[PDB]
């Protein structure tokens, strides 16, 4: 079916412009659809921004009057979003979504891209290993963690053992303080499998091109 | 601007039971060609909204048939014959009949299950962070229910509330529980100054709190 995917700078300076791209695969953008831009604010309110249909016809929400521009490049089968004069109020998750012009069906959304409007500086994170205390390793289950601290902006991706370990994992939302984010993740495995089977935290922060692969070492002799 | 009002704001449902949510628009959504541009979308935790119902009463592409949209004019209803854990998330209604198109504020569907006490784990600052002059003590309160819980920190028996940051997760669709993370951040100098660190969790599953501690310099 039709698949959409956003891309574009995740951080933008106030009063500058936001510029996103949506690549469509499995369907020509010059057919049947209406390509929309929709954004979700931190509170979870959705706002329709606008669209450009299969024939190039556009339409945008009056709430953005003059700041929005929606275009396309048929040779590349992509449509774009441009929002100028941004402010922190434009900070939100952006989505592109296709809907049939005829009935508004077959709605397909991209994975969504987060865009932060700030003057703060990009900072890579410190990935700290969370090794369990001796006392809490004698049960049938053991819980380990990983602490990603001091990064900006969002997001970061975190997996365990390159994604081969997904059961019993809890990755919490990041908390912001002083223009810096902190996030944690926990993973629970059968105690007898650790430390025999190593457990590694894989963290990536695209904004700073940084990657960390921290193996959790047991407290005590290693 | 057409105002889309959803209700209830939240809703708790036991697996297997039916669910019904409403959406009322400030203007009729029927057009000049007999179509009603009313859609229903579900947004699971961390995912992007996804199609459910379109054209007011028609089931969208690939959507399970447990979903049923109904109504006309300004009152619409979404019914789930029988709820499954994977239905948890936020439900939205959207209208494409009046420019500009608007969304409802959403309805959060929560799965109701048997109470569950949290699994508490406490972690000392790592060696690496210690070399940076900072010291974070982390505590995980995992897979509990209901979602209401309280975490208290204690340094050498004394409670500590400054320097604590918390984060919750959405409800998990695999077991319908919640999880929370609490972090106490101190300076390396202050951490190195005390001995015991305690993470106290109080949940309705027990009259007395679940306590986890460790002594600095002890495995």
XYZ file of C-alpha atoms in Angstrom:
441
model
C 0.000 0.000 0.000
C 0.880 3.665 0.176
C 3.631 4.414 2.682
C 4.689 7.838 3.877
C 7.828 8.953 5.594
C 8.935 12.262 6.946
C 12.381 13.729 7.164
C 13.793 17.185 7.860
C 15.694 19.177 10.500
C 14.432 18.411 13.976
C 15.773 21.606 15.498
C 15.034 25.125 14.272
C 15.949 28.585 15.515
C 13.142 30.932 16.510
C 11.925 33.220 13.727
C 13.471 30.955 11.096
C 11.729 28.287 9.019
C 10.726 24.687 9.454
C 11.208 22.536 6.354
C 9.848 18.987 6.069
C 9.716 16.394 3.334
C 7.353 13.483 2.880
C 8.378 10.696 0.597
C 5.597 8.538 -0.745
C 6.176 4.975 -1.871
C 3.751 2.513 -3.398
C 1.596 5.181 -5.072
C 2.009 8.175 -7.348
C 1.364 11.533 -5.726
C -0.356 12.691 -8.897
C -3.170 10.235 -8.287
C -6.357 10.135 -6.206
C -4.997 11.508 -2.910
C -4.790 14.705 -0.944
C -1.414 14.997 0.790
C -1.829 16.541 4.239
C 0.366 18.011 6.916
C -0.968 17.567 10.428
C 0.700 18.390 13.692
C 0.237 17.237 17.271
C 1.147 19.544 20.134
C 2.788 18.401 23.395
C -0.663 18.313 24.956
C -1.855 15.915 22.235
C -4.105 18.297 20.350
C -4.120 17.687 16.611
C -4.254 20.516 14.114
C -4.753 20.129 10.389
C -2.204 22.326 8.603
C -3.159 21.835 4.968
C -2.749 19.812 1.803
C -1.746 19.577 -1.805
C -3.824 17.143 -3.825
C -2.986 15.018 -6.846
C -3.418 17.904 -9.251
C -1.300 20.374 -7.290
C -4.248 22.186 -5.706
C -3.485 23.366 -2.164
C -5.338 24.537 0.944
C -4.140 25.443 4.437
C -5.588 26.318 7.837
C -6.270 30.058 8.324
C -4.607 29.746 11.731
C -1.246 29.684 9.949
C -2.111 32.554 7.613
C 0.868 33.446 5.433
C 3.431 31.290 7.245
C 2.699 28.057 5.449
C 3.692 26.719 2.069
C 2.931 23.216 0.794
C 4.673 22.004 -2.345
C 5.598 18.899 -4.288
C 8.159 17.424 -6.660
C 6.488 14.851 -8.845
C 9.780 13.669 -10.335
C 10.698 12.519 -6.817
C 7.177 11.680 -5.662
C 7.513 13.891 -2.578
C 5.552 16.749 -1.040
C 6.884 19.433 1.287
C 5.989 21.628 4.221
C 7.461 25.030 4.939
C 6.553 27.053 8.026
C 8.251 30.393 8.542
C 8.468 32.788 11.500
C 8.390 29.895 13.930
C 8.240 30.311 17.696
C 8.309 27.827 20.566
C 4.569 27.514 19.966
C 5.364 25.665 16.747
C 7.098 22.961 18.704
C 5.235 19.742 17.950
C 5.246 16.400 16.186
C 4.651 16.801 12.449
C 2.852 14.292 10.272
C 2.112 13.865 6.634
C -0.927 11.803 5.799
C -2.668 10.788 2.652
C -6.437 10.682 2.351
C -8.506 9.811 -0.685
C -9.846 12.978 -2.228
C -13.069 11.148 -3.062
C -14.137 9.894 0.380
C -11.333 10.642 2.832
C -10.522 6.946 3.117
C -7.304 4.891 3.035
C -5.745 7.355 5.476
C -1.995 6.689 5.699
C 0.321 8.505 8.088
C 4.077 8.751 8.168
C 5.906 7.851 11.371
C 5.922 11.523 12.334
C 8.915 13.780 12.931
C 9.526 15.851 16.027
C 10.496 19.461 15.536
C 11.731 21.689 18.310
C 11.902 25.447 17.980
C 14.670 26.514 20.299
C 17.847 28.518 20.512
C 19.430 25.917 22.807
C 22.465 24.001 21.631
C 22.632 20.445 20.374
C 24.283 18.311 23.027
C 25.234 14.657 22.872
C 24.112 12.398 25.731
C 26.010 10.500 28.385
C 24.925 6.871 28.543
C 25.327 5.429 32.064
C 24.888 1.719 32.860
C 22.476 0.745 35.621
C 23.800 -2.420 37.236
C 21.627 -4.093 39.900
C 22.741 -4.151 43.527
C 23.977 -7.550 44.726
C 20.994 -7.949 47.001
C 18.590 -7.746 44.089
C 20.184 -10.445 41.971
C 19.235 -13.503 43.999
C 15.683 -13.815 42.693
C 14.395 -15.581 39.589
C 14.259 -12.279 37.703
C 16.771 -9.463 37.540
C 16.263 -5.908 36.318
C 18.956 -3.795 34.625
C 18.830 -0.288 33.302
C 20.373 2.444 31.247
C 20.413 6.176 31.878
C 20.687 8.597 28.945
C 21.477 11.996 30.426
C 22.108 15.540 29.300
C 21.133 15.553 25.638
C 19.336 17.987 23.341
C 17.215 17.931 21.375
C 14.926 14.959 21.078
C 14.935 12.274 20.217
C 17.206 9.350 20.914
C 16.645 5.730 20.049
C 17.343 3.016 22.547
C 17.438 -0.731 22.120
C 18.838 -3.696 23.992
C 21.226 -6.103 22.311
C 20.622 -4.414 18.952
C 16.897 -4.966 19.319
C 17.127 -8.725 19.908
C 15.976 -8.107 23.474
C 12.535 -6.531 23.454
C 10.529 -8.406 26.085
C 10.372 -6.977 29.589
C 11.649 -3.595 28.468
C 10.480 -0.251 29.817
C 11.694 2.937 28.172
C 10.274 6.025 29.883
C 9.535 9.465 28.389
C 12.357 11.945 28.708
C 12.211 14.762 31.202
C 13.484 18.200 30.311
C 15.357 20.545 32.597
C 17.654 23.421 31.731
C 17.496 22.713 27.989
C 18.728 19.164 28.618
C 16.895 15.844 28.442
C 17.213 12.730 30.542
C 15.706 9.346 29.784
C 15.921 5.892 31.315
C 15.163 2.358 30.257
C 14.848 -0.902 32.103
C 14.983 -4.498 30.987
C 14.057 -7.607 32.943
C 15.451 -11.046 32.191
C 15.599 -14.431 33.862
C 18.234 -14.046 36.546
C 20.034 -17.265 35.609
C 20.774 -15.909 32.133
C 22.753 -12.987 33.555
C 25.634 -12.299 33.378
C 26.185 -15.370 31.189
C 24.299 -13.665 28.374
C 25.565 -10.076 28.194
C 23.142 -7.172 27.982
C 24.042 -4.055 26.046
C 22.302 -0.748 25.807
C 22.359 0.825 22.311
C 21.730 4.547 22.280
C 21.665 6.816 19.266
C 21.225 10.574 19.116
C 20.837 11.594 15.449
C 21.059 15.335 16.130
C 24.694 14.955 17.187
C 25.555 11.877 15.128
C 26.460 10.087 18.355
C 26.102 6.432 19.219
C 26.884 4.621 22.440
C 26.866 0.881 23.078
C 27.220 0.375 26.793
C 27.432 -3.145 28.125
C 26.039 -3.613 31.614
C 28.786 -4.915 33.899
C 27.860 -6.566 37.210
C 28.674 -4.711 40.392
C 31.554 -6.529 42.022
C 34.092 -8.728 40.145
C 33.876 -8.586 36.358
C -14.509 26.585 12.679
C -16.454 23.429 13.365
C -15.986 22.312 16.958
C -15.662 18.569 17.492
C -16.570 17.549 21.014
C -15.737 14.069 22.253
C -16.931 12.364 25.381
C -16.088 10.814 27.692
C -12.576 12.222 28.043
C -11.437 8.920 29.486
C -12.885 5.454 29.809
C -11.887 2.241 31.556
C -13.017 -1.056 30.061
C -12.564 -4.690 30.993
C -11.268 -6.924 28.217
C -14.183 -8.571 26.473
C -16.683 -5.838 27.344
C -18.136 -3.305 24.892
C -17.039 0.309 24.582
C -18.855 3.332 23.254
C -17.536 6.832 22.643
C -19.223 9.859 21.139
C -18.380 12.831 18.972
C -20.661 15.764 18.304
C -19.911 18.515 15.811
C -21.176 22.074 15.965
C -22.294 21.756 12.328
C -23.849 19.062 10.160
C -21.195 17.029 8.346
C -23.345 15.895 5.410
C -22.264 17.339 2.068
C -23.985 18.238 -1.219
C -23.356 14.793 -2.697
C -24.730 12.643 0.126
C -21.365 11.933 1.767
C -20.497 12.523 5.406
C -16.813 13.232 5.963
C -16.527 11.882 9.497
C -13.570 9.686 10.458
C -12.490 7.850 13.588
C -8.844 7.306 14.391
C -6.935 5.458 17.055
C -3.529 6.470 18.308
C -1.719 3.797 20.247
C 1.055 4.920 22.625
C 4.023 6.092 20.580
C 2.392 5.479 17.207
C 0.886 7.796 14.657
C -2.927 8.038 14.419
C -4.424 5.287 12.287
C -7.647 4.887 10.316
C -10.732 3.112 11.692
C -13.930 4.523 10.279
C -14.520 6.909 7.394
C -17.553 8.329 5.640
C -19.244 8.290 9.040
C -20.449 4.682 9.015
C -17.996 2.825 6.778
C -15.140 0.607 7.991
C -11.756 1.751 6.649
C -9.158 -0.342 4.823
C -7.958 -3.334 6.799
C -9.643 -2.249 10.032
C -10.956 -5.103 12.236
C -14.743 -5.394 12.149
C -15.106 -5.067 15.930
C -15.352 -1.346 15.221
C -18.617 0.277 14.199
C -19.271 3.898 13.377
C -22.764 5.360 13.413
C -24.805 8.512 13.512
C -25.491 11.420 11.173
C -25.973 15.166 11.179
C -23.883 16.152 14.192
C -23.939 13.140 16.536
C -21.588 10.250 15.829
C -20.717 7.180 17.827
C -17.928 4.646 17.776
C -18.586 1.257 19.284
C -16.212 -1.559 19.999
C -18.128 -4.832 20.220
C -15.556 -6.415 22.511
C -12.406 -4.686 23.766
C -8.943 -6.163 23.388
C -5.850 -4.971 25.243
C -4.416 -3.674 21.959
C -7.296 -1.213 21.617
C -5.928 1.005 24.365
C -4.912 4.467 23.222
C -6.552 7.759 22.256
C -9.550 7.960 19.900
C -10.116 10.964 17.644
C -12.869 12.074 15.342
C -12.164 14.268 12.357
C -14.360 16.214 9.979
C -13.419 17.077 6.437
C -16.747 18.642 5.468
C -16.067 22.206 6.691
C -12.879 24.143 6.044
C -10.658 24.154 7.946
C -10.819 20.501 8.970
C -10.889 19.904 12.714
C -10.194 17.128 15.213
C -11.947 16.203 18.411
C -9.923 16.439 21.625
C -9.803 12.667 21.873
C -10.972 9.923 24.221
C -8.479 7.833 26.130
C -9.395 4.165 26.404
C -7.831 2.418 29.361
C -7.877 -1.308 29.949
C -9.175 -2.397 33.332
C -7.468 -5.325 34.989
C -6.624 -6.982 38.247
C -4.570 -4.991 40.707
C -0.827 -5.549 40.567
C 1.894 -4.441 42.924
C 4.998 -2.786 41.467
C 8.370 -4.428 40.990
C 10.811 -1.980 42.566
C 14.502 -1.797 41.673
C 17.071 0.719 42.846
C 20.334 1.559 41.056
C 23.384 3.420 42.380
C 25.234 6.046 40.311
C 27.531 4.403 37.781
C 31.292 4.737 38.091
C 31.353 6.775 34.900
C 28.908 9.394 36.123
C 30.753 9.631 39.438
C 33.861 10.806 37.591
C 31.825 13.710 36.252
C 30.880 15.174 39.617
C 27.245 14.192 39.158
C 25.394 11.343 40.860
C 22.051 9.917 39.771
C 20.130 7.322 41.768
C 17.447 5.598 39.698
C 14.382 3.648 40.814
C 12.017 1.677 38.619
C 8.477 0.844 39.690
C 7.363 -1.642 37.022
C 4.214 -3.431 35.892
C 1.678 -2.212 38.413
C -2.034 -1.371 38.396
C -3.913 0.891 38.931
C -1.803 3.746 37.564
C -1.786 5.787 40.780
C 1.416 5.392 42.785
C 3.769 7.389 45.010
C 7.546 7.297 45.328
C 9.534 8.641 48.256
C 13.306 8.949 48.554
C 15.332 8.634 51.715
C 18.969 9.439 52.324
C 20.187 7.987 55.610
C 16.645 7.637 56.872
C 15.744 11.258 56.047
C 13.271 11.998 53.270
C 14.491 13.878 50.218
C 12.210 15.642 47.783
C 14.525 18.081 46.039
C 16.256 16.903 42.885
C 13.694 14.228 41.986
C 12.341 13.732 38.461
C 9.620 11.237 37.521
C 8.362 9.758 34.288
C 5.504 7.472 33.591
C 4.709 5.176 30.743
C 1.447 4.666 28.998
C -0.482 1.543 29.687
C 1.139 -1.512 28.188
C -1.064 -3.486 25.845
C 0.757 -6.716 26.641
C -0.311 -6.878 30.297
C -2.348 -3.691 30.836
C 0.031 -2.390 33.519
C 1.942 0.822 34.084
C 5.542 1.624 34.980
C 7.283 4.605 36.470
C 10.847 5.814 36.764
C 12.155 8.002 39.524
C 15.554 9.610 39.522
C 17.288 11.438 42.326
C 20.175 13.560 41.093
C 22.815 14.876 43.472
C 26.339 16.180 43.126
C 29.101 13.618 43.400
C 30.233 15.388 46.554
C 26.883 15.053 48.259
C 26.446 11.447 47.204
C 29.873 10.519 48.534
C 28.804 12.128 51.812
C 25.896 9.789 52.689
C 25.585 6.011 53.027
C 22.080 4.638 52.588
C 19.679 5.303 49.728
C 16.081 4.194 49.839
C 13.308 4.128 47.311
C 9.844 3.807 48.795
C 6.818 2.887 46.726
C 3.266 3.094 48.051
C 0.508 1.414 46.042
C -3.065 0.297 46.842
C -1.889 -3.294 46.437
C -0.368 -3.033 49.906
C -1.011 -1.117 53.108
C 2.717 -0.727 53.726
C 5.231 0.611 51.137
C 7.621 -1.470 49.072
C 11.118 -0.504 50.089
C 14.450 -0.970 48.309
C 17.804 0.256 49.598
C 21.546 0.060 49.130
C 24.598 1.352 50.922
C 27.126 3.301 48.954
C 30.365 1.328 48.666
C 28.565 -1.980 49.045
C 27.719 -4.266 46.132
